Every structure is written in structure tokens, then in C-alpha cells.
Write a protein that binds this ligand. Structure first.
Ligand SMILES: [Mn+2]
Ligand SMILES: [Mn+2]
Ligand SMILES: [Mn+2]
Ligand SMILES: [Mn+2]
Ligand SMILES: [Mn+2]
Ligand SMILES: [Mn+2]
Ligand SMILES: [Mn+2]
Ligand SMILES: [Mn+2]
Lengths: 456, 456, 456, 456
């Protein structure tokens, strides 16, 4: 009569189910957010899916004869990725979309980051995504991204990942003299001129020139690569915590790592979409960025998807529209899991819990559901039925007790067509933090939830 | 040479004019916002307009032979509605649009609303639309909305409307102990776990189980309908003040009721559009929701209109664009009427008054007209001329003395095409309150204003 | 050996007991506080009790031969009422009194309420009883009371009750501009010049005169009745929420309505006293007003009772005194029921709960039981024994955790004679609010508690 | 229809009416509160009424043959006074009472007032009545009251009234050094050890003894009278502003003087009662004190009236009660007149104005009419009719805009019997101030209002 929210484990066991993920996803995912921390998820992911897919340039209508069982991908200037999988029924029927953003909050060098203050030389930054809690100091950082020569040569940078690479970080006054630093926790650490990349070793051939420490590093930075102090202007700032994601907990039930935010959904959605064979209705996977920053144009709210489903529908011309209007999406993004350290911030009930399956959010806004997509019950009911047959544990959540925190997912952006969207995703611990936590059971369950969205 | 604004009454009289609305609209409208308080305005309204209109599914090109004198409607998943009326000239010429949102601020059950605290059992909620003034307590509430079974069965809920139905409400500490509740009127009543639906009557067959009061209600809720504690997940939360709208004032000149906000415009715009025969240029009426929450996608800023004027233009294919660019709209929404209780909040002049006709708002933003549509003078002048010939009283207003309150109508959303839009609507008293007030004279005048937007 | 208060229901059932009140009192009471909201309880109640009772003017000693089985009532200028019922034993023995106040907090027009500000015309008010929480705005109001012509003609006013009567109410700034209204919830809505009774409809024959809207309403108010702008001076201000009391809750276990405060006790005490046949010791029921305002003279702490028990003892002369000294009273008044929304305001234990029977309050004061009657244990024990034999559920309560709220019942006022008094009554939800809640089970139980005070 | 009040004058003129008061009451009253400033109003008043009246000790039943046309007075330990006037009908019928307090706020010496600090010698005080605004400094003071020798000899003190008597007063720091005295106007002048009665003139025969200045004054105080430093213990402290009341204004339309508070009503009520011949129903005038301090026992809420109407009814024994219950009273006391210097403190309408006749107050309490008598409309209407026939201008007022100031008249104290009471009185300017202002027209009108309360 009354409803109870099952737990993911127990039900699992099976000796199979467990193994099928304990090491299953916690290996694939567990490693994904280690060798990919800067929206280059595209590369590593595009390398995968080598088991078919192409489109991109190979558009000859019959180059791959766009029809039943075909699979293609489209790259958006390397920052975004969208995958297709044609099915029996015609596109005009509808679609089965899975969406997720691959970007994540982080720090990143300014246009002229290199400067030298008091001997040592720092590197200007400018946080992105709203890490708000600037407790990004002390812990070890690594540099990623890319630099573009004036001639157009793209050089890849990745320092601090290998156990032999040096590391970087932001300093913070010692407690002994941090007395004056007490006003408002809200922010007493917020500048954008932090992070020193080199001490002494001053300088290059010791040929004078005030900024010796700086001069030296530029030269060191010149030997590797082939940049100049300029070039940074046309570079790609990327500071992220160093270290591979790890097993979290004495029972290895969780995973601690950077980027967990949605990148975990972007992954499960990937595998689900990847190992999806025999399609009844053409389904597609979208992976964009700029979500954490507002989802502005170019590579987020862009038409890259719009003017692509069409460029794909071409391989059966004119608008028709219905194509998108009759689709069903599952725009997923991580949610806040109930933390036993700060309970008064959530409503207990109506809150996602670590390990109770995949999360569903009918609405997610601010002062009165303001600015956000509101899933239709009829559609929700369907998902219920579906996630019942193929099983899979699911739970519904809300972000904090009513008037607490704010929300806004990219779910409404596509619903603008008339689709049936709803918010999904895994429950995380300490979001937007350099190290996030997740439940392997949830990761697993979520994937199955996605995969169980192939049929009907 | 010096314009002066005159009371709608007096001019009326005629013994006819009065009767033609005193009981005229105050009956139709007066009853509309009584039997429709939860965006089901679509249903009751779609039932009306039975005098023609259809489209929806009956699309055969010649199924109704889309041409002169034809009238059709389009339903948007029940949450939205748009009506057409073909005229002599071709669509490519332009359109005569009337828009309004049918949604209104209210409370509405969470995903897992049923819970039991200290004997009695409450129902979690989460206000929508920004009622900000949570003085939604003490007074009697009714439940509306719909619940969807896992199988897809749609059950309709409407408790608290009939004089024999029980009622509901939110409690508030008695003044005797409300002493500690003094800090910031801004909010000392704001939770989302209010509203008890049942006391004692504990429980069902008294078969133990801690949450007895709860268990009992779920069972009671099970006999009627056929839901379980779940299902709420795929339900449609809807708490609204109970009671029919009434005649307000010793002279029955005003109307007190819930939903007045724009639903009053949505109505006058309806009748105007409905009793509109012999069309020169094809005109259409739009009624969407989610306005009070931001007008997000799916059922507000969606393409439902875009990809529909076309699906309709089909019954003469290719974009052409001009169709929309050459249209004229009258996006209406209620405005704040000058309240003699709080005068210092408005500029006196440049403020709408109760009974001085239909209201016009050239602009309506915040700090410096920020974020809002600004009507063109050339278009305004035209409306003037028109609302002069067919008579009709009109007045121009501004929302509060400059840097007071904020604004933002869905007028700019359609002007994005290049249309000639302007803000209209009736003047209300205490907006977004469980009980709003309006002037019958204004209601009437407004309608005539709309209707007088048919030809000249 | 240990105690637990149990619940009223369960014990009931019997299929009879339930029916004997579910519809039993919830019908009588349920309707009482609907057709009587302004201390006219006297009238409707005096009309009842037609099954005997009279006294008033018919005092002839043998006019009704004051002796065994006689029943009479005494009206106090219509504002108060007291009923008697002679028993076997002589008055000199003692009495069995039941007391309660019939007045309740509300708004009410000043001496010169009618005025016109900015077109429309309002009506000055001045709350009574201490509604403190001026959240009496937005919701619909009705006018009651009486107006007295200079000649002495009493005209009755009752507008807003019938489904066809117009309504009234107090306005409040829309949230859009309510920003400046944030300081102290304690009071940012408190004036006494609120409530508009008429808009436009300006004016009467349009014969000029600045205050047209006003002039018109006075004329309208003149056609009905026959008053002038004066007369209000000798009128009886009475603004109360409109609408009949209703069934509260999905299980119709409670009742929501205005006046619940003590008027509920005044009723149960009535029926109990009414259907009380075969009296051993003469018992009497008192119903006064002005309690919510201090219980001042004229119709509260007056001698109306004193110089009446005597005027009645006459039908055996001289003081004797003992008559009152040897009586037992049950001065009842509603208490605050534990609200699951605001728990920290009460001590949990030692607090009345919705449905645990009739409430008993040994003491009820402020800073240290200050200013209030303290019931004697010997008397309390007796009541226990009694309410055990005839059964009836009872619970003891305290108003808020010690130093929280203040108290003061009219119980000590009669104990001044030496009587054995104690505080009784039903437990309510949100007291002094336009809409109060009560448990039918408690209503019932309370009555039985009273009736079970006829003998033993 | 509508209505206005207009200024008592104009209507007057008559050349008679004016003279009949311009010099009429402004002479009698004008002089009363000059030769009587300390509840010795009794003496001067008792000396008047020499035209009959006595009772007091002369109680012989036939000593004056208590019957038609008889007039007697009763003295209450000199602090209170009550006058009777038998009429045709029997006492059992009812009474026509006029009440008023004769006491007024003022300062008054402690039990041990005489002390010497730094040369000069002061006199301890302790304000009475709540002058709250301690702006009782700088201006000239006079001493009244009485001192009682141990033997019982009553000595009368009255210093500072004759143009040749010395004066007294309270000092206050010069503005030059009053800088530190800025915190809270609420009170930065509040001690009770102010008022110096003698400088230098140190001392008596210069026979040493530290407190010389003191010693000297005691001696000086000894020559006159015959007191010692003790005796003050059994003395009657009385400090009041010195000077006769005067004509206020260029048109001599008002009167400025001390004691105006109710003492003005106590006077008009006196003359009215005094020149009242041919009585239909026995009418009586009451004049008590302690009102400004709470109206406590002994000489205010005492039984002096109760056990007196009886001691008088004796000259027809047993309680009967009805005697008082069927009476009509006019408990009067000054009200606050609208001051053009501080308008925002009153509601404009519903406020008494200087010169618009006698004032009527249906209610006068605090937070919601709390603690105060509420006059019945039926009674009010009657007064209207009456004050219409005999003419007389009247106006209704309220003390400050709702939740402003507090109130509490001794009107409810007698209504406790069941009488028909209502608040009357003249409108004053700056109440409880050392110098109050009143309108001669109002004074006059009020008296006529009282007198016009003789028949029916
Ligand atoms: Mn995210
Ligand atoms: Mn995020
Ligand atoms: Mn709005
Ligand atoms: Mn609106
Ligand atoms: Mn009360
Ligand atoms: Mn009460
Ligand atoms: Mn006073
Ligand atoms: Mn006074």
C-alpha cells in the first residue's frame, strides 16, 4: 500500500551482478575520469566506438548507405560529441535521446598567465563553472589543455599526471598568521593570481633581466613544446587536481575522483548507447559542454544538434518537424546525495541517497520551480513501468529543502521542441569539489536504467 | 489638448452596455475561474469552441478543406492551447495574434508528499510561481490535478470544491506563542512540509505499523481512485484555494477569485476570438503556461506555435518567414492596479486604476527597462486610433515607481520573429494572492479592446 | 502502573458511537458556527431550548411555579445568556455550572467607517480580540452585526453569507512590489483603514460632489435598510470570514471554521445542558462575551449572573452566600493542540493532542502561573473518578513550554466566590485564525465529559 | 445621506449663547482649576452646592425626609465626592449617573523628602499618574497638600500661588554641557531627587551641624506650621505648576491650565448636575480619584458608591439589585484633540477636533479594544436622539490610529453592574502636561450635553 525505497545491493549479489560492475564499471568509468579530465572526453570516447560510427566527413549518402543498423558520430570542434544509431522505424517517427554535459568546474590560466612576483613566478587563473568553495588550494594540481601556435600547430599539454611529472598548486597563509583571515567564509580566498609554477632556478644563462625566474621558466617551457610568452593568448587554460580516481571506502563500494559531475552519467550513457544492438526506433546520444557555465552557444545550446539530425535525416528532406517533437529524452546530470554531515540542508524524504539506484527529478529550479523543465506525469509513469520490467532501482529526489539551493539543468533546452524529457543521473557526494564520490551500485543501476530505455 | 482618463462606467450605462456585462462577463468569467483552477482551462475551453474548430488529429488537407472561414485548434499535451481562424487574405500576409498564459501561482505536492509526523499525517508541498507572500496559510484549500497509474490510467482528483467535500490547509502557530516568530516578515513562514490531510482515524483495521494515521489515509485514498503510496511520483500536485469566485463590493462592481492573474485575459481574449466572425486577415489565439515560472520550454517558449503555424500553413510550403514577421500581437497579462492602502509604492500618474479601461504597457522591466519587450510607437499609435473608432476605454501604466518592483512578460518571446507586440491586460488588486480582485467594467472594456482588434 | 492517554477513536467505533457524532455533532456544531458568527449565538440558541425555559420576563413566582424540574433562561441585552435547571436538592446546597464565552476575535467598522480614498471607497476597521497575526487580508469577508436608527429601529445586516451575496476583504501589496515590506513579521500589516466596499459605479445620478464613489454606496446602502452616513455611530461593526464551516481532512475527522474558539465549548456545553433530564442538584449554563478582550464589565465580569442566581433563588431570600460557595464549575475554553509544523514551541508531554479527548488545565498563566486560576487536586481527582465511570477520554495540557506564551481564562472570575473550578475545553489548531480546526472525536468526547458532570 | 460636524461656534453667536459661556464657563471653570489643583476640589465644590445637599452625617430618615426634590452629598475621606438628587419615580426604577475623576498627574514629595546635597537643600519627589514626559523641569512649581501632626492636627500647605509667595522647580543641565545627555528622549530626565527648596541662607543661628542649609529650612518650615523633619512621613506630597489658568489664543477661544484632564469634565458635570431642577428619575454625580494611577481601591473602585446608594436607598431595604442595573451613566474623561503639529499619530477621521462639540467614545482600549468598556449601539442611538432635540454639538473619536496609544477609562468599572455606559468628555491639547488646552465652545457644549441628559 505504502511505498518503500529498495537498496541497490542485496538485490544484486547473484555473484554475477556484483562482479559485473564491482569491477565492471568501476574500471571502465573508474579509469575514464583519469585519462580524461578536460573535455577531451571526445577524443578518448571517439577513439572508442571504433566498432562502427563515422559520419563526420564520410557523407556520401551511400558511403555507408544510411539505413537500418547504421551508426555514426558527429564531432563539434572537438568540444562536443553526438552519436546516432538507426533503427527499423523511420526518423519521422521519433527518437530516443540520452544527453549529458562533459565539462566540469575547474581553474584555468588567463590570456597572460605567466608573471613573476617576488622572486618565484606564478600563473594567473580564473575559475570556471562556479567551484564557489575556493577550497581548491593546498591539494596538488595538474595542467591539461592545449596551446595553439600562430601558424596553427596544436600542441598538447598534460603535466602532473604521471608519477614522474612535477605538480602544481595554490598556496594559502599558514594558520599561524591566518588570524586576520576570518571575515566571511563566503570568501576570504578568491583572487585569480595564484599558483606558482617555479621557484629559484633563476634564471636562463643568468643573463640579467629583472624577471629572471620568469625568463627561465619561459625558456624551460620553450624547450618542450615551442611556445613563446604569447601563444598563451591562443591557448587552452586547464588546471585540474592530479591523481587517478580511486576506490573509496573500506568496502570499495564508492569511487572518489574529479569530474564525477555528469561525466559519470556521460559515461554510463555512453556504454549503454554503445552496446545497444537491434534498434526499433533510432536513438541518439548527446555530449556537450558549457553546462556548468550557463550552456551558452557555440558548444552547448548551439544548433549543432538541430542542424545535424537534419544533415543526418538527409541520408526525406523538408522540415516536417515532427521528428523531434515525437522524441523522448533522458537528459541526465548528477544530483546531491544526502550527506550525514549536513542533514538540515535537505528534506530527508524526497532526497537522493547513496546507493538507492538511479535518480529522477520531475522539477529542479529555485524560488518556486523557477526556470527549469517539469517532466510530464504520463511520461514519468511510462519510465516507471519500463524501469520495472527490466528491473533497475530508481529513486526520486529534490535539491535541498525547498528554498535552499538553486537549480537549472539543460533539460528544458531540448524540450523546447516538444520532447518528453526528465532529469536523471547518479547521486554524488560533495559536488563541484576537486574530489567527488559516487556509489558503484548507483553507477551500474543508472547504466541499466539507460539501456532499459532502448525498447518501448 | 490635455488628455484625461475617464471611468469606464458612466460612459456605459445605456441600460444595455451594463447588463451586457454586469451579468455579461461576470458570469462567464465569473464562473470560468471556478470550475477551472488548474491549467485544465484547456479542457473546459476546448469543450467550448465546439462551434467549429478541430484540427488536432483531423488533418486531411480537405478533411475540413483549410480555406476561408475555417477554424481549428491545437492541443499541446493538454497543458496548452492555440486557436486559428482563417481569413480572406493569405497567411503569408500576416496574423492577428492574442496571447496569454493560463497557469497561476499555487502550492503543489512533492514526489513523496504523504508522510506522518506526530500522530496526524501531512502532505509535503513546494510552492510554484512565486507566491512569495506565504500568507497562504489559515484559509481553506482544495486539491486538484491528476494522478497517473503505472499502467497509464489517468485519474482525476478534485477535492474541496463541492459544498460537501472536505477541505485542506496549512497551519500556523497561534499568536499566543508566535512571539519568537518576529524576525523578517520577508519570511518566517516558508517550509515545504505543511498541510495535514488527516488526523486521528488511526488507522486501517488497527493492524499496528507505527505510521498508523498515514497507513489509514493511504487506504482511504486507495478505495477512491486506485493509487498506492507510489504513483504520487507520477502525479500532478495541485493545491488551490477552495470556493467559487464571488461578487466583490456593495455595488457588485468587482470580482474576487483565484487565478484572476492573466486567466482573466486568457478568457476575454477567448470570447473575443470565439465570437469573431468574418475575418479579413487570419487571426489566432495562444494560451500557454509556465509563464509564472519563467516560461521555459515544453509548454511555454516551445516551438508548439512555431511548428504549428507551419503545420497549419501546409493546408504554400517553404519557410517564406514573412508570415510571422508581418503579424501583430497583443500579448496580454494583468497589471498592478493602484491600491489606496499602499500608495507610496507607485507613481500615481503612469499607474493603472481600477475601472479606467484596458491597460497598455510600452515597457515592463527592472533596473532601466532591463529584460522586456518595448512596443514601437508607430504600432501604439495604430492601436490608439483603433481603440478610438470602436471606442473602448484604455489607460497606460508602469509597474511601480521606477526602481521598485521587477517585471518580465512573455511579450518579447514572440517579438523575436519581428512582430509588433505590446503589453495589454486588466488591472488587478493584490496579484498572486489566493484571492485577487478585478473590475467588471475593465473585464468588459478589455474584451471589446481585443475584439476591436479584428479588422481596422 | 504507568500511564498513556490513548486515542478517542478505536474506543469509539461501536458503529453507533461513531455515527452518533461523525454526523452527530458534526452537523449540529458544524452548522452552528455557520449561521451564527457574531455573538448572536444568543438568538439562535435562545430559539432552541424552546423545549422549556423562559424566565426572562415571565416572573410570577407561580408563573411557572419555580420548583423541581423547572428550566429557565435569562437574556443579557442579547449579548449574554444563562440557563438554569432546578433539581431535587435546594439551591442553598450548591450548583453545577458550565461556563463559556461566545465572542471571538474579528474586525469591526469604526464609528465613521465609510470614507473614499482615490476613487474607490473603503471602510475603516479596528480589530478586536487580538488577532495579532493580521494575516486576515486576502481571504473573503462577510459583514454581520446590527445598525440602530436614531428612532431606535434595529436593522439586521448579514452580507456575504449567501452564495449570491457579494463579499468583502482587505487588500495587500503584490509580491512584485512588496520588497520594501520586510521589516519585522511582527507587524508590517496593521492599519485600521482597510477593506474597500465599492469600486467605480461612481456615483449616484452622477450629480457631482467630489466623493462620488462614496456618495453612491451610501445611497445604495440607503435603499436597503434605511440608514444615513450617521447611524454608523450607533451601529454594530462586524467583519468575519465568509463561508460555512466544512469537513476538514480526507477522512472527515476534523472541522474547519471560524469562531471555533470556545464557541465549540459553548455549544457542546449547550447540548449537554439541554438534553439533561432528572437533575439531582440544580445546574446552570453561562455564556458571556468580552472574554477575548479582557472580560470587562457590562457583559462578562458583570453581576448579571450574581444578581440573577438570586433573582432566581427568590422563586429563600437573604444572602446566605453558601449557595455559590458550594458549587462546582467547569469553565471551559479551547486550548492549543500540538502542531506538527511548530513543535519547538511546546513541551510535547503536557500538551494537548488532536483527538485525545477533553482537555484539562490545572493552571494557565504566564511568568510563573501568574494571573490565573489554579484548580484544587481534591476537585481534580473527583473529576477523574467521574470521567472514568461514564468513561470519556481526557488529557491534561499546558500552554507552551513554560516561559513561552501567556494565558488567562475567565475561570478565576467565578472562583472568587469559593467554587471548585477547573479549565476544560477542546484542543484547536491555529487559534484566533479566520479558520480554526477541531477533532470531531474531541468535540464528542468533550460533550460527554460535560454531560457526565450531571451527577455522581 | 451623508454628514458633517462643523465648529460649535457660528451656531452659537446668538449674542447670548456666546456671552453665556465666553465669560460664562470661562470664569467658573476658568477659576476652578486655579483655586483647586490638588483633589481638594471636594472642599471648594462641597462649599458650593450650599444650595441644599448634606446627608454626610445628617442621617435621620426624616432629618431631611428623604423624598421628592431632595438633594444630598457624601464625602469620602475628603478625597471623593458623590451627589444625589431624588426624582418622582422610585430609586428601584434606575439612575442617571455622571462620573469623572478629580485627580491629575503631578509630582509629590517622598516620605523623607528633605535632604541637603552640596550646600543647597533639595526635596525628594516621585511623580504620580504617569506624566511620562518628564518635561516638568524648568517651569515654576507650587506646593499644595496637607501635613498631619502626630497628634492629628491637619495643617494646610499652599506655597507659590499668591503673587508674593516664593516658587519652586526642578533644574536641568544647561545646553552648554548637556551634550552627554542625548541617548533616548524616552528618558534622560527621570530621577526622583530633584527640586531644591533653599540655597545659602545657611543656617539657623549658624550653630554648626554639617547639614546647615537643611537645618535652616527645617527651622523656617517650623516657624510656619509646626512640623518637624518627621511628620513628612504622615504628610501629603503635592507639587504642581504655579499660576492661574488663562485665556489661550488671540481670540480668547481656548483655556490653558493645569488639571484640565477630566477636572474640566468633573466641573461641567457639576454645574449641569447642580442647576438641575425638577427630576423625573433620581440622578447622581460621582467624583473619585486614583484614576490616573489605576483606579485602585479606597477612593476609586471602592464600594463608597455601592454601599452608599444603598445607605441612601434606605431613606425599601433588601438588595433588589435592579436599582443599578437599570441605570444610565455618562462616565466622562478628556480625549486627545487632533494636533496640527503631530498629525501622523491620528487617523484624521475618527479623531476629536478642537471645537466640534462633546466627544463620544464607543470603545477605548489597546491592541484590539483590549481592556475597556464598549458602549451598546441601542444606548448610543438614544443619546444621539437626545443630544439632537436639546441640540448640542457632538463628535465621535478614537485615541490614535489603531495600534498607537493605549487606553482605559473607569467606564467599565460601573458597567459591571449592567448599566448603560459610554465615554464622554471634552477634547484637550497636550494631555498630562503641566499646561493643557481646551475649547470654551467645547466646555460649554459638553455641559449642555450633560444637562440634556436630565430628562429621558
Ligand atoms: Mn552537471
Ligand atoms: Mn552541475
Ligand atoms: Mn504574474
Ligand atoms: Mn501574469
Ligand atoms: Mn482566546
Ligand atoms: Mn478562548
Ligand atoms: Mn488620564
Ligand atoms: Mn483622565
Amino acid at each position: 500500500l505504502l511505498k518503500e525505497y529498495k537498496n541497490a545491493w542485496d538485490k544484486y549479489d547473484d555473484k554475477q551482478l556484483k562482479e559485473v560492475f564491482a569491477l565492471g564499471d568501476r574500471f571502465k568509468n573508474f579509469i575514464s575520469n583519469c585519462k580524461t579530465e578536460r573535455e577531451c572526453v571526445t577524443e578518448l570516447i571517439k577513439t572508442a566506438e571504433k566498432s562502427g560510427y563515422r559520419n563526420i566527413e564520410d557523407i556520401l549518402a551511400k558511403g555507408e548507405t544510411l539505413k537500418e543498423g547504421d551508426k555514426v558520430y558527429a564531432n563539434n570542434r572537438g568540444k562536443g560529441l553526438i552519436m546516432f544509431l538507426i533503427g527499423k522505424e523511420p526518423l519521422y517517427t521519433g527518437f530516443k535521446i540520452l544527453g549529458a554535459h562533459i565539462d566540469s568546474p575547474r581553474l584555468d590560466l588567463k590570456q597572460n598567465p605567466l608573471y613573476e612576483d617576488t622572486d618565484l613566478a606564478m600563473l594567473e587563473t580564473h575559475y570556471y563553472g562556479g567551484i564557489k568553495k575556493y577550497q581548491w588550494v593546498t591539494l596538488p594540481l595538474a595542467i591539461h589543455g592545449v596551446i595553439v601556435k600562430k601558424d596553427g600547430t596544436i600542441v598538447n599539454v598534460c603535466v602532473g599526471e604521471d608519477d614522474n611529472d612535477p605538480v602544481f598548486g595554490v598556496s594559502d597563509i599558514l594558520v599561524h598568521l591566518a588570524s586576520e583571515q576570518l571575515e566571511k567564509k563566503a570568501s576570504k580566498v578568491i583572487e585569480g593570481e595564484d599558483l606558482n609554477i617555479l621557484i629559484g632556478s633563476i634564471p636562463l644563462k643568468d643573463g640579467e633581466e629583472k624577471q629572471k625566474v620568469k625568463h627561465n621558466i619561459m625558456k624551460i617551457l620553450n624547450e618542450k613544446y615551442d611556445i613563446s610568452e604569447e601563444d598563451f593568448v591562443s591557448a587552452e587554460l586547464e588546471i585540474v587536481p592530479a591523481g587517478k580516481a580511486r576506490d573509496y571506502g573500506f568496502d570499495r563500494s564508492m569511487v572518489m575522483g574529479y569530474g564525477q559531475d555528469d561525466r559519470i552519467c556521460a559515461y554510463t550513457s555512453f556504454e549503454a548507447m554503445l552496446e545497444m544492438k537491434n534498434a526499433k526506433k533510432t536513438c541518439i546520444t548527446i555530449l556537450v559542454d558549457k553546462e556548468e557555465v550557463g550552456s551558452i552557444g557555440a558548444t552547448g545550446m548551439q544548433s549543432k544538434f538541430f542542424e545535424n539530425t537534419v544533415a543526418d535525416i538527409m541520408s526525406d528532406e523538408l522540415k516536417l518537424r515532427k521528428a523531434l517533437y515525437n522524441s523522448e529524452m533522458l537528459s541526465s546530470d548528477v544530483s546531491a546525495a544526502f550527506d550525514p554531515n549536513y542533514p538540515n540542508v535537505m528534506e530527508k524524504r524526497n532526497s537522493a541517497y547513496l546507493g538507492k539506484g538511479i535518480v529522477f527529478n520531475k522539477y529542479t529550479g529555485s524560488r518556486g520551480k523557477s526556470g527549469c523543465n517539469d517532466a510530464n506525469p504520463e511520461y514519468i509513469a511510462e519510465l516507471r513501468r519500463i524501469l520495472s520490467k527490466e528491473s533497475v532501482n530508481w529513486q526520486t529526489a529534490e535539491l535541498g529543502k525547498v528554498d535552499q539551493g538553486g537549480g537549472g539543468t539543460i533539460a528544458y533546452i531540448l524540450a523546447e521542441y516538444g520532447m518528453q524529457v526528465i532529469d536523471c543521473g547518479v547521486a554524488l557526494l560533495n559536488m563541484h569539489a576537486p574530489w567527488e564520490i559516487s556509489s558503484k551500485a548507483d553507477i551500474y543501476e543508472t547504466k541499466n536504467g539507460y539501456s532499459a530505455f532502448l525498447n518501448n
